[PDB]
């Protein structure tokens, strides 16, 4: 009586994702009672167990026909111990392998059923055109990250025989361009660093493949500290910036623009004071020029007061497509009186439906025990206990970043909160980020999923 | 309106047999009306049609994952012609192909649905453990043939969705050993040529693999023209020959012996003359020694008279498991009076049930128009129109031999008569000899299925 168990996967029938490279796992035997005498059991492959697995679990899998290299298959179990040595399995990818899920059973002489997912050129097996239920907006810092990593990130939704895969993000924000004065000191202009220039300059390689995979790709525009910005433009300056943004979006085939309201370094006293009214007039002008292309707003603590009320009849929430904050790893509910976690009323935008507000914008930082309690607490209490279910439609991730030492814990969770609420809590569907675990996955701190190639 | 058809196969859905080697075929377009103008069409692969084929024909096929190399895919149809050029298709075997029957639809962009049977290491896909209805006995001339060709010959039984494969033979007779006088001329001794010595000396390679797939393997023992044989032995000579045969079967893991009563060159007038009583006495002693191992008898014109009668209370038909004749390509009915084909009364063995008698023994020789009419006539009239149904149990093929120029016609027929009667006539099941057609098949006169390797 024992259990052939996977060392690196809690699933009793682990599902490995094979994206044109080899995959591997170690398996071991776990006896119910300690071994009396030292015995050596051997693991072997028994592909004749496929049809029985299929009939029971409703699957239609085919035996994995590629080379499977089992090393240290002699499971030595020392006397007095309950868990044997670890055999190592490496599944070998070959281009002859068709894209599907395969089944390779392993027997001890219990049984562990390994399922291998051979990906197609663009997506894993069982990818569906069924769209994501919520809006997942992701940032990419073009200084450290390839925008095309979004086309390598998927959710594993459901359990067999109803397994489906979808892209983890629906909108991708590209960081960044900036607003600066021209050389003459009169007009604003958009400045592009070397990295954001290469991505835009080769959009058929970086932006257009994302769009073919169902992504809306926007350009984030921030401030460059010269005192000119979205909230203090005059009439002539505004027409310039609206024209340049309109041109930029059509020029490089972008789907919209993200207005990041920070790093403008506005002056506190003078004639060009930043106002919410100016911000409303500017976005209204931008909406007229770019039509149905997306406008999103990233509110910060440097944002102007008065967005809670109408400015000259304009409500910013009515003109923008989405809006979120820089209050990372915390759920911001501006519509909650006597909010136990904190008063988020400064983040109230007039005319903005709760469905257009990313209440949770997450970043890849390590969090304390109190920070983790506040995060999970503000998430569950506002969406489930307080009834603010309309705050589960937009989830924002400020920079999909490389997982390194220290941020491994937050790296596993800061992309799954959107699907956790919408799929696991609000429905029955289990969500899982793919390719996360395993060598070469996103959670491998010694690998890069989609690295920068310029 | 047109028909995409195969040149070498008249079936709409050709079933190609892939046994760890590549398989190929040519196709063409046949228009229902001549080409008004000169046009060129192109053929392609549409694995989406796999589903509708499955639903219509009740199959569970999966699209073929291997590489299909199509050449001349542009079909040139000159004006006034109804048939386009030929396109060549090669289906590539690879170790990454699991054993199954795969479907590969081919479209002109009518449809030709190709079915690929990727064999396992031992049998084609859809091989069944269901045993053969009749007993098919096959000889193998070890001087020209490898005994393991029997592990490559199958019957394709039925139609889809009720397709199955069985081995075409149940008993294999290995030619041959000889009985000669010892140096002093007082004892019989078994003699082995260089080829039959190698087969027995490496029975783990040649005999045992046949028995694993369910073959009963016997050794045929004839005469060497030295005047000593099964029918003139005394008491001391009989014990010696019985001992060495019992020893031979035990030594090489054989399942029985075939007593071929020919080429002994018995004396016409003298002291130790051949008699049917002597033969009955020797076989009775062989039955006691080898016990449940098989004794079979091949009667010839050189066989002794009186086998129709009980010799000293012994009936040879009671001690032998099977019996047949050397009267090739003609059904022999010794129990039928006023036989229109021929009086076969001299081939009658006392106490032999008809279910143990192989009335038809086939050999790979070309037949005249009259000889073929005698063959088909005697087979059909005796078993079906005269009601000798018990003569359909045992069928014999004397030397499964290489098909060459001149015997292509008899090559296709002389292995399927037993299945034609028992499966096609007496049941609804359709029989096909696999792997017969195609390059490398048994009917390819420029290839050897399982050749000699010694």
Residue numbers in the entry:
A (entry chain A), B (entry chain B): 42 to 150, 163 to 507
Authors' text:
We found that PUL16 also encodes another putative GH18 endoglycosidase variant, BT1284. However, this protein contains non-conservative substitutions of both acidic residues in the catalytic site, thereby lacking the canonical catalytic DGxxxDxE motif of bona fide ENGases. We found ENGase-like proteins homologous to BT1284 throughout several Bacteroidales species (85 sequences in at least 20 different species) with similar substitutions of catalytic and substrate binding site residues. By enzymatic activity measurements using complex type glycans (from both animal and plant sources) and HM N-glycans as substrates, we confirmed that BT1284 and one ortholog from Bacteroides faecium (Uniprot ID: A0A6H0KVH8), which we named as B. faecium GH18-like, were indeed catalytically-impaired. The crystal structure of B. faecium GH18-like revealed the presence of a TIM barrel fold typical of ENGases from GH18 family fused to a β-sandwich domain in the N-terminal region (DUF1735), similar to BT3987, as well as a β-hairpin motif common to GH18 enzymes with specificity towards HM N-glycans. Structural surface analysis in the putative glycan binding pocket of this ENGase-like protein, revealed that HM N-glycans do not fit as well as in a bona fide HM endoglycosidases. Together, these data indicate that ENGase(GH18)-like proteins were unable to hydrolyze or bind N-glycans in the assayed conditions, but may they still play a role in the metabolism of N-glycans in HM-PULs from Bacteroidales by some as yet determined mechanism.
The genomes of Bacteroidales contain genes encoding glycan-degrading apparatuses that typically co-localize in discrete clusters known as polysaccharide utilization loci (PULs). B. thetaiotaomicron contains almost 300 different GHs belonging to 60 different GH families, and secretes at least six mannosyl-glycoprotein endo-β-N-acetylglucosaminidases (ENGases, endoglycosidase hereafter) that hydrolyze the chitobiose core of asparagine-linked, or N-linked, glycans (EC 3.2.1.96). Here, we discover an ENGase from the GH18 family in B. thetaiotaomicron, BT1285, encoded in a distinct PUL with its own repertoire of proteins for catabolism of the same HM N-glycan substrate as that of BT3987. Altogether, our data suggest that human gut microbes employ evolutionary strategies to express distinct ENGases in order to optimally metabolize the same N-glycan substrate in the gastroinstestinal tract.
